[PDB]
Amino acid sequence: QVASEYLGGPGGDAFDDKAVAQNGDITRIEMQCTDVATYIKLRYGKVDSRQWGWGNENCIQWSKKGEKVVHELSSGEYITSAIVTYGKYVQSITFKTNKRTLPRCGTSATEKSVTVLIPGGLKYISGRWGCRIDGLRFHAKC
Amino acid sequence: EIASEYLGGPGGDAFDDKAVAQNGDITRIEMQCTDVATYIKLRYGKVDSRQWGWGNENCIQWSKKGEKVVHELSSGEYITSAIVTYGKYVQSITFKTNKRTLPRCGTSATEKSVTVLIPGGLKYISGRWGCRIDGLRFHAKC
Ligand SMILES: OC[C@H]1O[C@H](OC[C@H]2O[C@@H](O)[C@H](O)[C@@H](O)[C@@H]2O)[C@H](O)[C@@H](O)[C@@H]1O
Ligand SMILES: OC[C@H]1O[C@H](OC[C@H]2O[C@@H](O)[C@H](O)[C@@H](O)[C@@H]2O)[C@H](O)[C@@H](O)[C@@H]1O
């Protein structure tokens, strides 16, 4: 499908939820959130992706950890906007759906900012990960 | 049925290319470009819309005119995203296709920017126009 630019840095390892996303529309957003977003894990239909981020509890050597944040999406709800601040890593993520605006994951929003609009709803994400979210790319439905 | 938010201001007159777009897939982008974009005019198959912007030469009282740019799309090329900078008016537009990033229409600016994904490729545009492009909305094929 159509996809955004890659937003972030060259670290970590690549991930791509294309296949897992064939299980269904995004139904849930799970993230780990402190002054930065340290992982993301979407649910596609009934099937969670892997935890993309916070690879190891010893990641606490290099960033804060944060708290788990869960956003359950209702039937027919889809992500239509992502505001990302990023540099070497993704710093913060603000999602908005066709039904509501979700709180920012990552209280600091000082890095370069980009707003990606996804008419019809986000289908899935790809990017890079390790102890944090090194970068993200947003994929539309066609 | 999939369409972006409207990006721009309340001035000008509404336009909508839904009917003329029945003439075919977009084959050409014509714009007029100075420091800002002053009109847009897509070609649907063989058929142009009316010129959306630079209503008449008196508009030189309020902004520069600019020069005509034409991007010819090859068969099978479709517009997959647009980076739009806007406020009261559309300031600049950078179109991207499945094959290439195209030149921006308009130069650098301080206004708000968004990246619009256009799932399945752009079908047609709507918006508002007068002396320039008051706003744009992207209607996708998905
Ligand atoms: O996902 C971010 C980052 O995770 C891993 O690196 C963790 C830290 O390793 C230290 O050696 C380094 O000084 C820190 O900057 C790193 O955050 C992973 O190896 C790396 O590729 C990822 O970018
Ligand atoms: O599409 C831009 C604009 O075109 C027309 O207005 C031209 C200018 O008129 C002046 O009176 C005004 O002070 C300027 O801001 C305008 O650019 C049109 O009438 C208007 O609706 C459109 O917004």
From TrEMBL, chains A, B:
Cited InterPro entries: Jacalin-like_lectin_dom, Jacalin-like_lectin_dom_sf
UniProt entry keywords in alphabetical sequence: Lectin, Pyrrolidone carboxylic acid, Signal
UniProt xrefs under SUPFAM superfamilies: Mannose-binding lectins
Cysteine pairings via disulfide bonds: C33-C105, C59-C131
Modified residues (Pyrrolidone carboxylic acid): Q1
Domain of life of the native organism: Eukaryota
SMART domains from the UniProt entry: Jacalin
Domain Jacalin-type lectin span(s) in chain numbering: 1-142
Molecular function (Gene Ontology), one example: carbohydrate binding
Pfam families registered for this protein in UniProt: Jacalin (PF01419)
Protein encoded by which gene: PPL3
UniProt-recorded name of the protein: Jacalin-related lectin
